[PDB]
Design a protein around this ligand. Structure first.
Ligand SMILES: CCCCCCCC/C=C/CCCCCCCC(=O)OC[C@H](O)CO
Ligand SMILES: CCCCCCCC/C=C/CCCCCCCC(=O)O
Ligand SMILES: CCCCCCCC/C=C\CCCCCCCC(=O)O
Ligand SMILES: CCCCCCCC/C=C\CCCCCCCC(=O)O
Ligand SMILES: CCCCCCCC/C=C\CCCCCCCC(=O)O
Ligand SMILES: CCCCCCCC/C=C\CCCCCCCC(=O)O
Ligand SMILES: CCCCCCCC/C=C\CCCCCCCC(=O)O
Ligand SMILES: CCCCCCCC/C=C\CCCCCCCC(=O)O
Ligand SMILES: CCCCCCCC/C=C\CCCCCCCC(=O)O
Ligand SMILES: CCCCCCCC/C=C\CCCCCCCC(=O)O
Ligand SMILES: CCCCCCCC/C=C\CCCCCCCC(=O)O
Ligand SMILES: CCCCCCCC/C=C\CCCCCCCC(=O)O
Ligand SMILES: CCCCCCCC/C=C\CCCCCCCC(=O)O
Ligand SMILES: CCCCCCCC/C=C\CCCCCCCC(=O)O
Ligand SMILES: CCCCCCCC/C=C\CCCCCCCC(=O)O
Ligand SMILES: CCCCCCCC/C=C\CCCCCCCC(=O)O
Ligand SMILES: CCCCCCCC/C=C\CCCCCCCC(=O)O
Ligand SMILES: CCCCCCCCCCCCCCCCCCCC
Ligand SMILES: CCCCCCCCCCCCCCCCCCCC
Ligand SMILES: CCCCCCCCCCCCCCCCCCCC
Ligand SMILES: CCCCCCCCCCCCCCCCCCCC
Ligand SMILES: CCCCCCCCCCCCCCCCCCCC
Ligand SMILES: CCCCCCCCCCCCCCCCCCCC
Ligand SMILES: CCCCCCCCCCCCCCCCCCCC
Ligand SMILES: CCCCCCCCCCCCCCCCCCCC
Ligand SMILES: CCCCCCCCCCCCCCCCCCCC
Ligand SMILES: CCCCCCCCCCCCCCCCCCCC
Ligand SMILES: CCCCCCCCCCCCCCCCCCCC
Ligand SMILES: CCCCCCCCCCCCCCCCCCCC
Ligand SMILES: CCCCCCCCCCCCCCCCCCCC
Ligand SMILES: CCCCCCCCCCCCCCCCCCCC
Ligand code: NA
Ligand code: NA
Ligand code: NA
Lengths: 221, 222, 224
């Protein structure tokens, strides 16, 4: 079941990528960079998840689905880049703030991987550092980044706020599932966690970009 | 023999690097970035191949020359960057298209590594995904990227087209040799593969940049 | 003692990071990028050194202990330090990102040769070490040659500051390959504990010290 679920995930990522490619061909005032980011996220995630489907992206240590971290260490900084470019749509870019989010995010995913490789108190030290990174990401998202979105007009700010809540709601689920699952307290079953880390990312990756791109395109007319 | 051949490769990379450094001192309207890229490619490749010569960049799994993938994952995106900056010479840059090529290329090399670590059907799934990335790279090269080259005038477009064909011809040899060699169908002997992945990269790396830089320098006024 | 020393290091990195954050809130004409770089260096290093403190960022190889977390630290922290140095030289003028990325490329190569040298034995070790030293020399040639000339093109006051930070960085950085060669990873003249203290004290000056000196100098160029 776990293999088939991952094949399914990868096929959905492939379909998402193709949809974003088709949209890119009639861009409606949205820059090519946004479409490129939208395509890389699912294609890379699809590849990583394909490795799990093929029985490669995991080892016994509990099962570590290490391919998930290879996925997220690329896909999640690109998602924050997407979020940051949305806030900045129609205005001056702040690449300093954007790379601040990328740095926090890459650190967050790494602490997760290290936490998964750790045992006892050490595991939760790393996990806790990852959660602290996420909180700071959310502080930036609803603080200075949102203020940039507001500086770019009511219609853009409305859209940014929607995508900001969408992203934030999904992202807090990841460390919650991690803590509950085999990598953490072990209250939730492996199969339950596998389904969560199949369904969440479909919404976090393809869902997010459908909502993000459609909203930005709608600002054209 | 395999060790000595790799020492030779590294010495040629070193010579190439120094030649590009000397050219950079009298740039003839070619930007420093092009000279930097031209030097990094062979220096990094030389280092990677030196590790093979010293017996470090390979393990038994059949022999995997993993240092080749460490080489290519840096050297091949830089080569496409070089190609893209050539198309854009004299005009506005399209870094989106450039990073599209970098992303495709890094994926291509990784699928190769994963394919080399795989057995049976799984190997050829990864290989096939790598080939699909290469096809898209070539489609970009002769499609949108060439159209940018054409927007920058007759003489630049002529040069870009030459370098584009040079690169494309060499690059399709890599997945061909891979499939024929021990990593694939195993028709070719290890020594045969080692020689191909010594001679190809000399032309793909040092050869390419001699052709690319000389062509751009020839466009210089006064 | 080695664990406690690393905990101490990480706490000092954390304090440095917070100080640079507070400075960033009243920037005095210094761009946000400089403050971001100043914070990333110690935070990343603190993380890497925390792994050593917890007993994770090291393994036994050739009977010697390899502190592999130091290389994970440096491969990110040292290119960011040269970026900081390069942006100082370019302060008030056109940027040269080609020269900046030249330094980043040399630096990342340097740290990798170090790691490979640490994993190597006999002549092979010193081939890698030697390539790393050659990278450092070229970095220093850039620092006192073309990069300094960019600093001079941005006026007397900036060039004076750049030269100070350039000497500060250079003096600290030549110590790293010296300690490495003398210590367990090299000739084995110096004891593990000696090396551990060197690679605790040097980086406090190389990371937090450097940025205090760099940022204070740039801020002092502001007229309020
Ligand atoms: C094993 C893998 C190792 C990978 C190693 C990765 C190193 C990360 C750092 C790179 C240098 C950062 C470059 C900084 C670019 C300069 C920023 C700039 O242009 O500044 C503009 C201005 O200062 C703002 O207002
Ligand atoms: C694990 C894989 C890591 C790969 C990292 C990327 C390798 C290096 C290639 C980067 C491409 C650099 C292109 C620079 C564009 C310069 C454009 C300009 O001159 O304005
Ligand atoms: C592919 C592109 C990015 C995702 C890749 C990561 C998964 C790689 C996993 C390779 C493990 C193979 C080992 C084995 O066959 O046992
Ligand atoms: C460890 C690996 C980490 C690599 C992370 C990959 C993605 C990182 C950053 C993406 C930044 C995109 C910049 C967009 C520029 C906006 C524009 O000018 O259009
Ligand atoms: C963990 C490792 C992550 C490393 C991240 C590196 C970030 C460093 C530098 C970012 C520089 C951004 C400069 C942008 C200037 C232009 C602008 O602000 O719009
Ligand atoms: C989950 C908990 C953390 C999220 C907190 C978000 C706070 C945003 C601050 C808003 C502001 O800076 O004005
Ligand atoms: C939807 C169906 C409900 C399935 C159960 C929900 C998950 C609870 C946690 C667990 O079962 O480990
Ligand atoms: C599995 C299929 C993918 C599921 C993704 C969708 C998430 C929700 C997106 C809803 C917005 C689409 C319409 C719109 O915003 O214009
Ligand atoms: C510098 C360029 C990259 C070099 C290649 C990596 C070399 C391989 C290092 C592992 C060798 C360990 C051993 O001695 O067995
Ligand atoms: C590796 C990941 C590649 C995807 C990253 C983001 C794309 C960044 C492109 C920046 C575009 C700048 C403007 C332009 O010249 O098109
Ligand atoms: C590590 C980073 C790996 C990157 C992920 C690999 C997959 C990326 C592929 C994206 C390329 C598709 C974009 C092509 C469209 C460009 C065009 O419109 O001509
Ligand atoms: C569409 C583009 C895909 C092209 C890829 C071709 C893969 C080559 C087939 C692999 C050989 C299988 C032989 C075997 O299984 O023994
Ligand atoms: C998913 C990736 C799919 C799309 C990549 C297409 C690359 C560009 C094709 C354009 C062809 C042309 O204009 O000549
Ligand atoms: C972010 C900084 C990263 C530090 C690397 C730490 C890796 C530790 C792995 C665990 C080793 C072990 O427990 O045996
Ligand atoms: C592993 C070692 C190499 C990794 C880093 C490679 C860096 C070299 C690549 C590209 C150089 C980018 C130059 C950007 C030019 C912008 C214009 C300018 O201001 O000069
Ligand atoms: C001992 C360290 C070696 C290097 C010292 C730096 C030498 C700088 C000289 C170059 C300056 C110039 O180009 O004028
Ligand atoms: C001042 C330099 C300090 C270094 C001297 C300590 C050497 C101790 C040792 O050999 O272990
Ligand atoms: C580059 C991402 C490719 C993943 C999609 C291909 C796998 C689909 C599985 C369906 C059988
Ligand atoms: C799964 C995703 C496949 C493509 C989604 C298309 C949605 C179009 C909405 C209008
Ligand atoms: C067995 C004990 C489990 C410890 C869990 C600790 C994690 C709590 C959530 C993260 C808080 C970080 C700071 C905010
Ligand atoms: C001014 C910058 C100095 C760079 C010189 C090195 C570039 C040539 C390629 C490397 C050769 C290494 C040997 C030392 C010279
Ligand atoms: C075991 C040793 C592995 C090699 C270490 C060097 C890796 C260089 C970086 C590779 C990714 C670009
Ligand atoms: C020696 C241990 C094996 C190291 C393998 C390194 C993998 C490098 C892959 C680069 C991306 C294709
Ligand atoms: C067992 C020995 C077999 C030796 C075969 C060597 C094959 C070398 C082919 C290299 C092709 C390079 C093409 C470069 C074009 C310019
Ligand atoms: C080594 C590849 C071919 C070298 C000759 C190229 C000549 C370019 C024009 C000067
Ligand atoms: C180091 C501490 C930095 C905290 C960052 C908070 C997010 C920005 C708020 C404006
Ligand atoms: C731990 C490694 C990564 C560290 C990243 C540091 C990010 C600092 C965030 C600063 C945000 C300032 C916002 C100003 C408004
Ligand atoms: C132990 C192996 C994993 C850590 C590798 C660190 C490499 C640092 C130099 C790039
Ligand atoms: C086992 C004895 C070998 C001694 C070699 C040490 C010399 C290394 C090269 C030094 C390069 C300059 C710094
Ligand atoms: C004035 C030209 C540059 C001279 C640089 C002098 C050598 C610096 C040595 C750095 C190590 C301390
Ligand atoms: C640019 C800074 C380089 C500093 C390197 C450290 C120099 C240490 C002393 C030279 C090496 C002596 C070799 C002795 C080998 C005897 C066995
Ligand atoms: Na966006
Ligand atoms: Na070029
Ligand atoms: Na600086």
């Amino acid at each position: 079941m776990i293999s088939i679920l991952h094949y399914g995930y990868s096929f959905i990522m492939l379909l998402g990528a193709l949809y974003f490619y088709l949209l890119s061909k009639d861009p409606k005032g949205v820059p090519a960079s946004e479409y490129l980011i939208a395509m890389v996220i699912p294609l890379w995630s699809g590849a990583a998840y394909l490795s799990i489907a093929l029985g490669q992206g995991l080892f016994q240590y509990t099962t570590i689905y290490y391919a998930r971290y290879i996925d997220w260490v690329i896909s999640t900084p690109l998602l924050l880049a997407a979020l940051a470019l949305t806030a900045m749509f129609g205005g001056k870019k702040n690449l300093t703030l954007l790379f601040s989010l990328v740095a926090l995010d890459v650190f967050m995913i790494i602490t997760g991987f290290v936490a998964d490789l750790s045992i006892g108190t050490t595991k939760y030290i790393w996990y806790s550092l990852g959660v602290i990174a996420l909180i700071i990401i959310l502080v930036i998202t609803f603080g200075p980044l949102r203020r940039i979105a507001l500086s770019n007009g009511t219609r853009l700010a409305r859209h940014y706020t929607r995508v900001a809540i969408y992203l934030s709601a999904l992202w807090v689920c990841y460390p919650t599932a991690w803590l509950l699952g085999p990598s953490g307290l072990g209250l939730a079953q492996e199969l339950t966690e596998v389904l969560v880390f199949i369904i969440l990312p479909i919404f976090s990756k393809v869902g997010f970009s459908i909502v993000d791109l459609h909203g930005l395109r709608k600002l054209h007319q």
